[PDB]
Design a binder for this molecule. Structure first.
Ligand SMILES: Nc1ccc(S(=O)(=O)Nc2ccccn2)cc1
Length: 185
């Protein structure tokens, strides 16, 4: 892929974060805290899951960014509609406004309904995410394996502005404390 030149500087939006997340001063890293982080509740915060949005909103053009997932056992990454549900239980699916992949229990899957098995030979330490708004495309790349394609959502019906989407995952096991980090350009 030659998508690197549509690189965008993504930062995390504290106001959208689940109340147990800790976002770094530079707004480029997020991790699960071991407790509530002493913030007020608001209607933007994801209540049920350890999720947070990027601050950037996209309604046109081509955008690319990279996320470091080193040593995590579980995570979700991609984009979502600005208007996705924040409270209660929900599925990650395009019907609900999400275009995502994830790691869970030693398998990688795309957030279709139902979910799609991914075939990754080299476990990724960094994931590249490409959005073409006009084409209706969201693609995922394995930066650890020379940028190899992981998955393409096509014929996407975005139906509104898009935001970068992150889930650091729970840490029931004590093996998933590591952060998600936005990688430098
Ligand atoms: N409906 C639902 C259930 C659990 C979760 S999760 O935050 O545990 N993260 C994930 C990620 C991939 C697979 C399972 N859980 C998110 C949404």
């Amino acid at each position: 892929h030659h998508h690197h030149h549509h690189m965008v500087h993504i930062t995390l939006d504290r106001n959208t974060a689940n109340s147990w997340l800790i976002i770094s001063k530079d707004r480029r890293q997020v991790r699960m805290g071991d407790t509530h982080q002493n913030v007020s509740d608001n209607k933007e915060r994801f209540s049920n899951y350890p999720m947070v949005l990027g601050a950037q909103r996209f309604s046109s053009g081509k955008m690319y960014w990279e996320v470091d997932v080193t040593q995590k056992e579980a995570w979700d990454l991609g984009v979502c509609r600005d208007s996705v549900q924040r409270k209660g239980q929900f599925s990650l699916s395009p019907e609900n406004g999400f275009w995502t992949i994830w790691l869970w229990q030693d398998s990688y899957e795309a957030g279709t309904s139902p979910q799609t098995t991914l075939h990754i030979q080299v476990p990724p330490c960094q994931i590249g995410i490409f959005v073409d708004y006009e084409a209706g495309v969201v693609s995922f790349y394995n930066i650890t394996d020379h940028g190899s394609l992981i998955y393409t959502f096509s014929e996407c019906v975005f139906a509104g502005p898009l935001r970068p989407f992150f889930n650091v995952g729970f840490n029931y096991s004590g093996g998933n404390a590591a952060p998600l980090k936005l990688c430098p350009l």
